[PDB]
Amino acid sequence: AAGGLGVERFVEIGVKSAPTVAGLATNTLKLPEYSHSTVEVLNSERDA
């Protein structure tokens, strides 16, 4: 926000551990982050 809000990509690594903190981020991207931002949640396991 202080450095500009433009497109961000959030990638989790460690293979099968990847869905967790992304799902943690996903639900977090929902509740406070409702501002309608373009964000990409990517997982090493799932989204390779």
Add this chain to the structure above:
Amino acid sequence: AHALVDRLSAGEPYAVAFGGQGSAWLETLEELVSSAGIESELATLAGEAELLLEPVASELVVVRPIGFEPLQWVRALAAEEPVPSDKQLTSAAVSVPGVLLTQIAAVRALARQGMDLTATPPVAVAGHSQGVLAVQALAAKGAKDVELLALAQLIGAAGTLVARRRGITVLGDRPPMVSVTNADPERIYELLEEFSSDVRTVLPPVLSIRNGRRSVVITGTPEQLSRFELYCTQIAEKEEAERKNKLRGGAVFAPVFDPVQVEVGFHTPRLSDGIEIVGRWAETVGLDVELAKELTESILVRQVDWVDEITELHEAGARWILDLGPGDILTRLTAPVIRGLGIGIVPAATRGGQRNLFTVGAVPEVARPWSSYAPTVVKLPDGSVKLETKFTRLTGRSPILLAGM
């Protein structure tokens, strides 16, 4: 034989209104040319548009080439093939002058048939946004006509150079101009002030137009406006959980939010660097009149408190208001504002409302003065006092009843 004008002379008074930007002007200008059988004015207006740009000693280096010959675009548009995109035509540089020309041509149309009658007399002439321009020289002599178009050419030009849209997204879609409905002017400014607390001095949103009681317009940078859009949505949703508890003080608000098609911020500090430049642009031309400085500030920076102005000329007891603005804008904005206070309003260049104008019998549209239905006192043979209403008059009794219980 125009009854209204004939009314205007002996009977009820009149006021001229001019619309602003966001009027969808081109299609009105295209029709106005096609509906015009008299091209006489357009000959001089086109030549003076060419002339006035050349002697200009003001900077105006970028503006003059990006200006376009009005006669060519019209004849092209009349061949039905050529015309630039709406995005190009809506840009302040070529749009602002074009809007005035539509309004000026709208003045001439009525002036063609009835001029001896359709000559001067308003009580006052008022305008909205850039509409205040065409107001001034209409109240001045006829040689000042292009000066409007001349200043309009300068207004949209500097405004464009200083600040222009750098981005847009199909969702909403997001402009510099935003409007919220149903919410108080105090409540809107609250959320505005709530959001403006979080942003820098360079891109604050501000209240531009107050269109009515609960209807307002806030403007600024498209991105920052989109941020204000977020808070109003969250409150709308949190209050939804309230309404479904079936409680009134605990009820959701049902506002209406949605952006506008306007391309650039007006009546905002973002145009502040434009005022100076515009001012010099007028003095280097034969446009010199002392209101060029005041018009610019009113249009570019100072807000427009609208309801209060046209109402002020209305509370003077002037019964009629016409609007020569493109399509027709501000003619209908003003109507529910005043409504039943005795004012009524015909859109000018609208064929239906002009049919009134040109006839002896179709003229007197005067909206109902609610005070007309104000209750009165009645006496009877046995000498009973009766309070008179539309109810009592029928029933012959007091305007009060015990409902079925």
Add this chain to the structure above:
Amino acid sequence: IEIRFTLTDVVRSGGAPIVEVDDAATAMRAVLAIAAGVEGPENLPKVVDNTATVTVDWDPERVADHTGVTATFGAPLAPTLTVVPDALVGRCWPAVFAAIGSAATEAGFPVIEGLLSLVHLDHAARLLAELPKEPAEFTVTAKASAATDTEVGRVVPVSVEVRNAADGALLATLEERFAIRGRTGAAELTDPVRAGGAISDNATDTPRRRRRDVTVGAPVDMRPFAVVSGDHNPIHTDRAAALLAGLEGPIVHGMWLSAAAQHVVTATDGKPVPPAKLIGWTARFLGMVKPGDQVDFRVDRVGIDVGAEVLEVSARIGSELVMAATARLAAPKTVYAF
């Protein structure tokens, strides 16, 4: 400004009743020199000697005009940067042209160049890892790497170095190659041969991925771009000069197209964040373009260089190929969590 010419008639040869003055080439130059530079910019290099651009400042309104000259919306495109790398060409233009003729052109070439016959081959901007920014001032240097002749004519590749004034470092490198069609030389000889590439140390390979289908209109008149870019060539403006050069009409500036297709690649595969993403772009002009032109562009994702995605662009007006473009783009910025 006026242009004069002279003829001479010897009728002893009937097949050659008219033979016209050999001073034409030098006479044409004096005419262009008055119009082009007006002695406004002045440095006096020979073609090999460096051509210097004194000082250059970027106003916020010069940002707007260019970004407004080329715009894209219908495809969800949002241009963002302080200075688009396309804006480099406006700064380096007046200097590059000065190298088109010289004593080295006098030695090995006839010095026969029609300016109307000038053809732009390729244009590219290579970054030194620095990107252009707000108010800091620029100073540009232009050098001619080689002067070549081809079967189709004379070619002059021009190297350009853009430097930030206040900081005093070289931000970017701009490359231009021009084609005059009438000349031959002992300087640099090419038949069909010229080649350029955007290369990087570490690379990854990918598969063809369709990104966007683009619709781009050409401007109504070419004068607006002519004012900003500083290209006054009558070919794109005056119809008499365009017809004299045997052209389809007042051809759209290839340079406008260059920024036209770029602005899309800027915003599309670049996404709402173009500024730090595109580190380079190259553009090849396949065919001429008339104003009022509906052109369809298509960018695809091909491969990866130095962690930056490469993006190939093809252009079609109906059946005709127009521009071949290729760009190096950084990926949408990634944040990692373990």
